[PDB]
């Protein structure tokens, strides 16, 4: 999920936005 | 925006900031 992308790796605000509602 | 590794509590604080009004969803660890 989020962890793998943004924690484990790094994210783009854009990628973090896939996690909004 | 930060080009950093956002983990644990920093992860959810980022998402609160980034989702705003709409809110977000945090899922269970793989
Ligand atoms: Zn910390």
Curated annotation (Swiss-Prot), chain A:
Domain of life: Eukaryota
Protein name in UniProt: Insulin A chain
Disulfide bonds: 6-11
Organism (species): Homo sapiens
Gene this protein is translated from: INS
């Amino acid at each position: 999920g989020i962890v793998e992308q943004c924690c484990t790796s790094i994210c783009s605000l854009y990628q973090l936005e896939n996690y909004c509602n | 925006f930060v080009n950093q590794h956002l983990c644990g509590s920093h992860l959810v604080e980022a998402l609160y900031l980034v989702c705003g009004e709409r809110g977000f969803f945090y899922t269970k660890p793989t």
